[PDB]
Amino acid sequence: MSAIRDITTEAGMAHFEGLSDAIVFFHKNLCPHCKNMEKVLDKFGARAPQVAISSVDSEARPELMKELGFERVPTLVFIRDGKVAKVFSGIMNPRELQALYASI
């Protein structure tokens, strides 16, 4: 169990138009690599109640990835005022993810 769950039911620009401060993780089904970042985001969100964090299957949501320029990779996307304010593809530890968020 963790606070980071797959949401396809509302995601992308039409959900971003409603939000003030949020984070979306574009994970994949097969690849073991994506599965780690959920545990990182859980520990990151546990001490930050005021940000809306979720994940989303990039193989179910490929029409969005076309607009941000993503290929097939574990991408963290950060939304402020409904605008993409910060973005990166890959994995990191929860110590260093604090500086990534602080940079925004």
Side-chain angles (χ1 to χ4, degrees):
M1 189 175 181
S2 59
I4 310 302
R5 299 289 76 189
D6 184 89
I7 306 179
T8 50
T9 52
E10 53 182 292
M13 68 293 284
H15 174 73
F16 304 160
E17 281 282 276
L19 79 81
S20 299
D21 193 300
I23 301 175
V24 182
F25 174 39
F26 286 76
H27 72 178
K28 225 186 75 135
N29 303 288
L30 277 66
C31 302
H33 301 294
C34 313
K35 304 192 167 66
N36 303 276
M37 215 63 207
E38 288 165 14
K39 279 78 269 185
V40 185
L41 287 167
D42 180 69
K43 272 71 202 170
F44 166 99
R47 61 81 248 188
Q50 78 307 305
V51 58
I53 317 179
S54 59
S55 61
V56 64
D57 178 21
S58 55
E59 299 182 307
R61 207 82 285 160
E63 64 290 85
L64 256 295
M65 296 217 306
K66 191 166 61 67
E67 308 295 286
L68 303 323
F70 316 143
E71 294 181 271
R72 62 126 294 170
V73 282
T75 303
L76 254 306
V77 188
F78 301 79
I79 308 294
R80 301 303 105 113
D81 188 63
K83 321 300 188 296
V84 56
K86 172 77 78 178
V87 60
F88 80 88
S89 306
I91 297 298
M92 67 174 67
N93 68 79
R95 326 181 68 189
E96 296 293 280
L97 190 64
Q98 309 311 324
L100 199 300
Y101 149 81
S103 181
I104 314 176

